[PDB]
Write a protein that binds this ligand. Structure first.
Ligand SMILES: NC(=O)c1ccc[n+]([C@@H]2O[C@H](COP(=O)([O-])OP(=O)(O)OC[C@H]3O[C@@H](n4cnc5c(N)ncnc54)[C@H](OP(=O)(O)O)[C@@H]3O)[C@@H](O)[C@H]2O)c1
Ligand SMILES: NC(=O)c1ccc[n+]([C@@H]2O[C@H](COP(=O)([O-])OP(=O)(O)OC[C@H]3O[C@@H](n4cnc5c(N)ncnc54)[C@H](OP(=O)(O)O)[C@@H]3O)[C@@H](O)[C@H]2O)c1
Lengths: 285, 285
């Protein structure tokens, strides 16, 4: 398939470069000129307009700054989208992806949302993960092209499924990193190097990953059975963590929300339950 | 060695039970009577006073509610601590452990601080982890007794080292769990079960654990080189996570501190650096 990339920022250039290096006939476009020098040198074709670029591709890959820019560029190319497949690799929300699917359908185009789980430099390597959602046959017809970026993981027909899982994985990653970064700040304040702490932390967190299936079972079942590590005891043990942080001059900012959630769970009567009881406490609607 | 346990709450009873089942001559004490029925039935001896219990053991294991209770009980038994080794398995802070080491030395006793990384039910199984710190020979003379509880990991001569690493590991665990719990709340609000999400999350977080060595290298070196995933882009991508959470009626409480830290890092000029630059931003002293 001939392919088109709209957007030549850091990620867009990596995307186009992976397509070129795989042999796909690739046409690229970007608002600001001078971003396709190496791409054109390697075999790509730089269109002068987005509509031109779109007309030269059966599969249109979009990677712009945000969903608002995306919707603006696409509105300009709406008359030419008919019969093509739109693959939005711009980051966005699940609802924005579902709205784009309906809008694309209104202009005769297929649609897939994508959430890139890798850095630009990893694009094109088999370990690079990109999540996709949308109609299964649309993914099927395009997956060999998407494989140029790395692994292509179809999550389901819901157009918003890729963005949902992308952002949820990011939430899990930022939680883990925030806890690790607080931990290293505590040991740094005591003069202990972070390099020697990493094996202990990795072994520990690897062990903690084994607690996830039981947590998920409790969430889905509503049976918040404890694995001996109950909310009430964990709430009682958090205070030493806060005090030791203050002892070392380390801010408690990263830890306060978990403390409050634990205290709120105890107030709600969940002291004898496991952490699966914490999930529905995050509901605000 | 004859051993003594002070404190028969959930953890203290598990500790004493592991000692009994290993064959150690065990003497136990507790403030409230009636907590040693099964222990005495299995071969333990219940002393009527803490001082009695202490006098019947060369190694005194303490597991009370908190450091304030610990210091009160011990003050009463100070005249009889001479020549014994004190192993405090009550949770506490690094400074409290260092102060107890000095106080114990003042009464002719050796001292080890311990931080229990396992649940009461796992005490006695080889996978149960307890961290220890204090003089290396004191640990050596006692480690075969400590092995009744599970693995005994000596972290160094600093009496506060076990509590420091214990609490740092807890910070990493609570960060990871908070991120996971937010993630499952997002997918739950979309009607997706947590059970099917767990493999993706475990694979993802296992991959993320591979980023730790580079982070630790940057912290120790002060060279906050980016792995392509720079602070500025991660700050720009966090907003979609917040918006998607609001879309699903999910509180953003667990995520706000990481957002603020990222924004603060950008303000401080670290937008092109990796997350290792975030550590020294947590300093308040
Ligand atoms: N890079 C990563 O590490 C990473 C990881 C995962 C996913 N992503 C996602 O990839 C997407 C792009 O990131 P990036 O690294 O490529 O960012 P970037 O380097 O800042 O590039 C932004 C792109 O948007 C274009 N653009 C901005 N405003 C525009 C407008 N008004 N009209 C038309 N085009 C406009 C820019 O074109 P000009 O050259 O004309 O400014 C440029 O091509 C984002 O949605 C991001 O979340 C990135
Ligand atoms: N359990 C866990 O999951 C877990 C995990 C890691 C570490 N730990 C640590 O283990 C320690 C004990 O936890 P636990 O589960 O045993 O708690 P617990 O079941 O609440 O037991 C608390 C103990 O403290 C005693 N105590 C309280 N106030 C006292 C006082 N004024 N004078 C004398 N004794 C007093 C109680 O004796 P009475 O029977 O007379 O009240 C009881 O033996 C804590 O430091 C905790 O952080 C526990």
């Amino acid at each position: 398939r001939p392919v088109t990339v709209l957007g030549l920022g850091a990620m867009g250039r990596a995307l186009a470069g992976a397509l070129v290096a795989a042999g796909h006939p690739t046409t690229v476009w970007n608002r600001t000129p001078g971003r396709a020098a190496a791409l054109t040198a390697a075999g790509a074709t730089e269109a002068g307009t987005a509509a031109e670029a779109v007309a030269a591709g059966d599969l249109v890959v979009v990677c712009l700054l945000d969903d608002e820019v995306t919707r603006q560029v696409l509105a300009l190319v709406a008359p030419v989208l008919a019969g093509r497949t739109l693959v939005n690799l711009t980051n966005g929300t699940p609802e924005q992806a579902r709205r784009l699917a309906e809008w694309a359908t209104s202009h005769g185009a297929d649609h897939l949302d994508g959430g890139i789980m890798a850095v630009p430099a990893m694009i094109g390597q088999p370990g690079a993960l990109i999540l996709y959602s949308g109609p299964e046959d649309v993914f099927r017809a395009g997956r060999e092209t998407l494989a140029a970026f790395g692994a292509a993981h179809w999550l389901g027909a819901d157009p918003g499924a890729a963005a949902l899982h992308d952002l949820a994985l990011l939430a899990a990653m930022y939680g883990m990193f925030g806890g690790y970064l607080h931990a290293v700040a505590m040991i740094r304040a005591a003069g202990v190097p972070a390099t020697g702490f990493t094996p202990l932390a990795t072994d520990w967190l690897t062990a903690m990953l084994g607690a996830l299936p039981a947590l998920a079972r409790g969430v889905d079942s509503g049976d918040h059975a404890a694995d001996g590590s109950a909310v009430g005891m964990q709430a009682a043990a958090f205070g030493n963590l806060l005090a030791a942080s203050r002892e070392g001059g380390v801010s408690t900012s990263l830890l306060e929300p978990v403390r409050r959630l634990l205290d709120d769970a105890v107030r709600a009567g969940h002291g004898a339950d496991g952490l699966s009881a914490l999930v529905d406490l995050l509901r605000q609607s």
